[PDB]
Amino acid sequence: GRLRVVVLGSTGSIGTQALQVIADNPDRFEVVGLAAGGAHLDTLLRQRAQTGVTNIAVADEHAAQRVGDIPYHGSDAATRLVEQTEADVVLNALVGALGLRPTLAALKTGARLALANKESLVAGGSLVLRAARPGQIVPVDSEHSALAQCLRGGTPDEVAKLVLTASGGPFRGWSAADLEHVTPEQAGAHPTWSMGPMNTLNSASLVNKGLEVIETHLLFGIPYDRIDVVVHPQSIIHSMVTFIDGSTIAQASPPDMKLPISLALGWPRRVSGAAAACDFHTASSWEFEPLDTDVFPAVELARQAGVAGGCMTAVYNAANEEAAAAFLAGRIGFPAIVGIIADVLHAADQWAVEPATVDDVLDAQRWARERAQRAVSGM
Amino acid sequence: GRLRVVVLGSTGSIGTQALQVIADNPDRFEVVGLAAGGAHLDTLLRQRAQTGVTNIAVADEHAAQRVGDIPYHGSDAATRLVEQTEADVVLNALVGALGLRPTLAALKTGARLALANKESLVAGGSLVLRAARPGQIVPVDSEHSALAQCLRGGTPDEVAKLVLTASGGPFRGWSAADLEHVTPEQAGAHPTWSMGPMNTLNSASLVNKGLEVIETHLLFGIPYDRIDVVVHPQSIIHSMVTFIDGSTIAQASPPDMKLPISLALGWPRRVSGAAAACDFHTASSWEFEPLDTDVFPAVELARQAGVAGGCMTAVYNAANEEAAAAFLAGRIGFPAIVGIIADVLHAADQWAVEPATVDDVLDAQRWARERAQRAVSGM
Numbered sequence: 001g002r003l004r005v006v007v008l009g010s011t012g013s014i015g016t017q018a019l020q021v022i023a024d025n026p027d028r029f030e031v032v033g034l035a036a037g038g039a040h041l042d043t044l045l046r047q048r049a050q051t052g053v054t055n056i057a058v059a060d061e062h063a064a065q066r067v068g069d070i071p072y073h074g075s076d077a078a079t080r081l082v083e084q085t086e087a088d089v090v091l092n093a094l095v096g097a098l099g100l101r102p103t104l105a106a107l108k109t110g111a112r113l114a115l116a117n118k119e120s121l122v123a124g125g126s127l128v129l130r131a132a133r134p135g136q137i138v139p140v141d142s143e144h145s146a147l148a149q150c151l152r153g154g155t156p157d158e159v160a161k162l163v164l165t166a167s168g169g170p171f172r173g174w175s176a177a178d179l180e181h182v183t184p185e186q187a188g189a190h191p192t193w194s195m196g197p198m199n200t201l202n203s204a205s206l207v208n209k210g211l212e213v214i215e216t217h218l219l220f221g222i223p224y225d226r227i228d229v230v231v232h233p234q235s236i237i238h239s240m241v242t243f244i245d246g247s248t249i250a251q252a253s254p255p256d257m258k259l260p261i262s263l264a265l266g267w268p269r270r271v272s273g274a275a276a277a278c279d280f281h282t283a284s285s286w287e288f289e290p291l292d293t294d295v296f297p298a299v300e301l302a303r304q305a306g307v308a309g310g311c312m313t314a315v316y317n318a319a320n321e322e323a324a325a326a327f328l329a330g331r332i333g334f335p336a337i338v339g340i341i342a343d344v345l346h347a348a349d350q351w352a353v354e355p356a357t358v359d360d361v362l363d364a365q366r367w368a369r370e371r372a373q374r375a376v377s378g379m
Numbered sequence: 380g381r382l383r384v385v386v387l388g389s390t391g392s393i394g395t396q397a398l399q400v401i402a403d404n405p406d407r408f409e410v411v412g413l414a415a416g417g418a419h420l421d422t423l424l425r426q427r428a429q430t431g432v433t434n435i436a437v438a439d440e441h442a443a444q445r446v447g448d449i450p451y452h453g454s455d456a457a458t459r460l461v462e463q464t465e466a467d468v469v470l471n472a473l474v475g476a477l478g479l480r481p482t483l484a485a486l487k488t489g490a491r492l493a494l495a496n497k498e499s500l501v502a503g504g505s506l507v508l509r510a511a512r513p514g515q516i517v518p519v520d521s522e523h524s525a526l527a528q529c530l531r532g533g534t535p536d537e538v539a540k541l542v543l544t545a546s547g548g549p550f551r552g553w554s555a556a557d558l559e560h561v562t563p564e565q566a567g568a569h570p571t572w573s574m575g576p577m578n579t580l581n582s583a584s585l586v587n588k589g590l591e592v593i594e595t596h597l598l599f600g601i602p603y604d605r606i607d608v609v610v611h612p613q614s615i616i617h618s619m620v621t622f623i624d625g626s627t628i629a630q631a632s633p634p635d636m637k638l639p640i641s642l643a644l645g646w647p648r649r650v651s652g653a654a655a656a657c658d659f660h661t662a663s664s665w666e667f668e669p670l671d672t673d674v675f676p677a678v679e680l681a682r683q684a685g686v687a688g689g690c691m692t693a694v695y696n697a698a699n700e701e702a703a704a705a706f707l708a709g710r711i712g713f714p715a716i717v718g719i720i721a722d723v724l725h726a727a728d729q730w731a732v733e734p735a736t737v738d739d740v741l742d743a744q745r746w747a748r749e750r751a752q753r754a755v756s757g758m
């Protein structure tokens with residue numbers, strides 16, 4: 001009675017940690033599908049051999065050709081893999097708003113969607129939500145996993161606030177002037193989490209936290225004015241829920257994604273030995289500080305976009321993707337990332353309309369990328 | 380609807396705070412009984428006048444002589460009140476040995492027992508556990524209330540460890556050499572108005588934490604070797620549960636006993652506005668450090684007593700009461716408190732037998748008191 005898992009983005013950080021959790025728990029889990037982009041064929045072939053799964057999607061046609069006998073190849077490969085593979089859980093660890101169609105396909109199959117790809121939910125918004133039954137989307141994200149656990153501390157009507165923690169990034173405490181000179185190398189560091197290149201930059205810019213505020217509203221149905229963000233440099237407390245009696249329930253663990261991965265895969269059942277627990281035989285401190293919203297307005301912009309609703313959250317994410325690419329390429333400065341997002345959101349009148357189809361979401365993103373490029377061109 | 384509440388020990392700290400919670404929540408609670416010792420008879424009489432509750436009990440027959448219209452007076456007045464009063468919740472906030480019989484009576488009525496009286500569990504042990512049905516006892520103290528909330532984080536089978544937080548008391552971080560100089564005043568002997576000198580002393584000696592560890596075992600059925608203590612000077616995290624996957628769930632609030640009191644009264648339902656929540660607008664830190672068990676062995680000793688079982692925890696507590704009072708009277712030094720507890724316990728193996736009656740518990744306490752007296756005097 002074990003769970004069949006499709007792993008999308010298997011060669012990345014989350015995909016590989018997920019495979020390790022599955023390998024350590026053959027009793028509970030079985031890999032039945034793998035999807036990757038094709039940039040790391042060494043890893044993918046290793047995964048094919050180690051798991052014995054030949055049911056693979058490779059996005060890059062040239063890379064799929066070089067491997068040979070890949071059953072699904074091309075831009076729709078991951079989507080068709082999901083549509084055609086019998087599974088109990090789809091782990092979406094793809095990166096960027098491109099995880100949207102596989103997310104929608106997964107929900108349509110009725111399987112659990114263990115969601116690491118927050119962008120697909122942020123972009124899909126109510127379109128993704130309509131495709132899901134209650135509890136079908138289970139968060140892999142450390143914060144959202146923590147929130148889901150802490151919500152067990154009371155009934156829904158007893159929730160006052162959801163409190164997301166943020167690491168603060170490498171630039172915690174820096175001034176606006178300090179941020180002007182930030183290099184791609186400087187933004188490529190993270191004090192607590194080891195992640196891919198986009199999540200690391202997003203954590204530095206605080207856009208990751210903005211995306212997580214939106215994800216929180218969408219997953220848990222809590223109003224934006226009841227979703228708080230506190231800076232916690234240690235990343236040990238992964239988030240908390242405050243109840244109407246004044247009690248706060250918090251989730252805590254040394255930073256290790258295998259914990260929320262393991263919990264997402266086998267929800268509601270915890271997976272014995274998934275990760276190390278906090279060690280209370282040695283001294284430590286858990287520090288909290290307010291976010292400097294003047295220097296880091298990305299979270300406030302996310303709330304604005306979220307409150308607007310419809311396709312506005314897709315716009316927020318798409319504008320970030322474009323500005324982020326420009327920064328990494330050395331075309332714009334670091335403060336310009338969130339500056340461009342604000343510029344694009346301000347122009348995004350038409351996009352408050354609720355998406356009826358995936359094409360509405362794609363239209364919004366297409367516009368947002370263009371408007372983002374316009375803003376880059378002007379600086 | 381409205382829960383009918385009997386308040387035993389209505390004139391003490393817990394009792395009066397509970398009456399405030401009840402006054403503030405007339406939708407949720409109604410007082411249907413009040414019981415007190417008699418030393419604060421005037422307060423009880425004012426309480427009858429304020430609540431309109433005439434169903435009252437006074438233990439002290441002398442005190443009762445002052446009134447003429449008390450329905451329940453004399454020894455076991457509180458017990459008789461419990462036996463003869465229809466109620467949904469009995470709050471047992473009586474102090475010491477006079478709490479045990481009312482606890483037993485409350486359990487037999489089938490009411491929920493909101494338990495503050497430590498002696499009921501620490502001394503009464505298996506007598507109380509054999510009488511109680513699952514979930515019948517709801518703990519009132521902050522650590523136990525924290526644990527009950529955090530246990531919501533998983534199934535019973537998913538619990539790895541219970542971690543109680545401890546303030547560390549006034550001598551946190553003190554060497555054994557430092558402790559030799561401790562005076563009653565330093566250990567918290569002030570004529571404070573609401574509470575006896577023992578509470579502050581028991582905190583300082585770490586015996587209170589030991590008592591809490593024993594009660595934790597009895598309340599939640601977790602072995603002593605899986606009940607840990609961490610020193611946390613802020614007392615914001617009130618305790619935590621570590622699950623088999625590595626996740627820790629923690630309960631946090633600014634110190635305020637109205638929170639755990641309100642939740643014990645309303646269990647399982649939280650009481651809106653009971654206490655203030657953690658506020659993250661100003662920076663703070665939550666510090667943890669190990670307890671030096673060489674310098675503070677009171678908790679290790681409690682586990683030893685608890686593992687031994689039967690009436691051994693009764694012995695532990697009674698030896699403390701005697702030794703702690705001897706320290707306050709200047710008959711011994713501070714380090715000798717836990718020293719005498721150890722010496723009495725090590726001589727106490729005849730008391731490992733399970734008590735059949737309340738008198739068996741009383742015999743054990745009698746022996747332990749006499750034993751500690753000889754240890755103090757040198758006889």
Ligand SMILES: NC(=O)C1=CN([C@@H]2O[C@H](COP(=O)(O)OP(=O)(O)OC[C@H]3O[C@@H](n4cnc5c(N)ncnc54)[C@H](OP(=O)(O)O)[C@@H]3O)[C@@H](O)[C@H]2O)C=CC1
Pocket residue numbers: 008009010011012013014015035036037038039040041059078092093094095096098116117118119140141142193194195196197199257
């Ligand atoms: N990493 C973390 O610790 C955390 C991650 N997340 C979220 O999870 C998601 C992934 O995180 P992360 O593992 O770090 O990302 P990574 O960059 O480390 O891995 C990205 C994965 O997606 C694959 N991929 C890229 N492009 C395509 C494409 N066009 N088609 C199909 N597959 C593609 C890559 O395969 P390949 O490169 O071989 O072509 C790779 O396996 C993100 O949305 C992130 O926000 C959330 C919380 C923390």
Ligand SMILES: [Mn+2]
Pocket residue numbers: 141142143212
């Ligand atoms: Mn996250």
Ligand SMILES: [Mn+2]
Pocket residue numbers: 520521522591
């Ligand atoms: Mn306590």
